C-alpha cells in the first residue's frame, strides 16, 4: 500500500537519524535505496531522496557519506525526472561543497561530471558547470581544480 510505505519510510528515516551503530545506519540506507530504486512513486522517491540527504548532511562517518552520495547518484543517472535530477544535483554540490575529504570531493565532481555529459538539458547543465565553477573557485587543492578545469572544457567542447 502506499500510505504503509510511506509510514515504513517515516520509521526507518527517524531510525537512521537517531542510531548509534554505524552498522544499523548503513543498513536502513540500503533498505531506503532499495525501496526507492524499486518505486514508479515520484512523491516516495522524493521523500527517500530528502531523507538520505539530510542523514548524509548530518553524518560524521566518511563511508555512510560516500554511501549515501553513490545512492544518490544511481537514483539520478536512473531517473527521466528532471525535478528528482535538479535536486540531487542540489543535494551532492551541498555535500561537495563544505566537505573536508579531498576524496569525498573529486568522487561528487565526477559524478556531476558523468551526470552533465550524459544530458541534453541545457539548464541541468548550466547549472552543473556552475556548481563545478564554484567549487573550483573555493578548492585549495591544484590537482582538482585541473580536474575540474578538463570537465568544464570537455563540457564546452561536447556542446
Same mark, same amino acid.
Given at each position: 500500500?502506499? %500510505? !504503509? ?7 526507518? $528515516?527517524? #531510525?537512521?537519524? =537517531? +542510531?548509534?551503530? *554505524? %552498522? ?9 535505496? !532499495?525501496?526507492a530504486? &524499486?518505486?514508479?512513486?515520484? !512523491? ?5 531522496? #530528502? &531523507? ?17 552520495? @553513490?545512492?544518490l $547518484?544511481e537514483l539520478a ?12 544535483? /542540489?543535494?551532492? +554540490? =551541498?555535500? +561537495?561543497?563544505? +566537505? ?13 561530471? =558523468?551526470?552533465? #555529459? ?12 556552475? &556548481?563545478?565553477?564554484?567549487? $573550483? ?8 581544480? %585541473?580536474?575540474?578545469? /578538463?570537465?568544464?572544457?570537455?563540457? @564546452? *567542447?561536447?556542446?
Amino acid at each position: 500500500d502506499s %500510505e !504503509e510505505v510511506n509510514e515504513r519510510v517515516k520509521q526507518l $528515516a527517524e #531510525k537512521a537519524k =537517531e +542510531a548509534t551503530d *554505524k %552498522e544499523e545506519v548503513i543498513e536502513i540506507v540500503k533498505e531506503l535505496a !532499495e525501496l526507492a530504486k &524499486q518505486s514508479t512513486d515520484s !512523491e516516495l522517491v522524493n521523500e527517500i531522496v #530528502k &531523507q538520505l540527504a539530510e542523514v548524509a548532511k548530518e553524518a560524521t562517518d566518511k563511508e555512510l557519506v560516500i554511501y549515501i552520495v @553513490k545512492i544518490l $547518484a544511481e537514483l539520478a543517472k536512473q531517473s527521466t525526472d528532471s525535478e528528482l535530477v535538479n535536486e540531487i544535483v /542540489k543535494q551532492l +554540490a =551541498e555535500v +561537495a561543497k563544505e +566537505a573536508t575529504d579531498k576524496e569525498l570531493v573529486i568522487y561528487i565532481v565526477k559524478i556531476l561530471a =558523468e551526470l552533465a #555529459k550524459q544530458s541534453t538539458d541545457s539548464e541541468l547543465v548550466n547549472e552543473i558547470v556552475k &556548481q563545478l565553477e564554484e567549487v $573550483a573557485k573555493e578548492a585549495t587543492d591544484k590537482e582538482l581544480v %585541473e580536474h575540474i578545469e /578538463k570537465i568544464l572544457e570537455e563540457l @564546452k *567542447k561536447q556542446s
